[PDB]
Design a protein around this ligand. Sequence first.
Ligand code: ZN
Ligand code: ZN
Ligand code: ZN
Length: 116
Amino acid sequence: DHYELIVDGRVYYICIVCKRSYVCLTSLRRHFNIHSWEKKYPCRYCEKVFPLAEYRTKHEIHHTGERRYQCLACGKSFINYQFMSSHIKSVHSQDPSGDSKLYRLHPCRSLQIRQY
DNA sequence: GTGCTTCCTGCCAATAACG
DNA sequence: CGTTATTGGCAGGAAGCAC
Ligand SMILES: [Zn+2]
Ligand SMILES: [Zn+2]
Ligand SMILES: [Zn+2]
């Protein structure tokens, strides 16, 4: 539940509770579950419950210890983008953020997500 | 001010629902 | 079963937090 804000040509969708704005309605619905708790996303490994599916997935990867992000310069693997990127910038003085091609994201094998 | 941890949201492929 | 709707993984910047 939202209202629309049209500014010179562009449409925005504004959340009725907290006023955040979204370029698409799908994002607003996804976000709104933080207010409504209509859907629940429980960790299958512990007691934590998450308002978004992606948050639970990232959390469950912490539990298994799977390292999907691999630096292609030296072979070292990392649990997420942030560690992969911080390693490449400090050790290799390169930005994985383009254009290059400096890391590999492996498929998730330690549990079953959608692939991709 | 450093660095770890978790969150956020546009984009769109994968999957599900629907009649 | 073909076709319209939903789900959620990804990048990479932002925010939150302990030191
Ligand atoms: Zn909101
Ligand atoms: Zn857990
Ligand atoms: Zn490296």
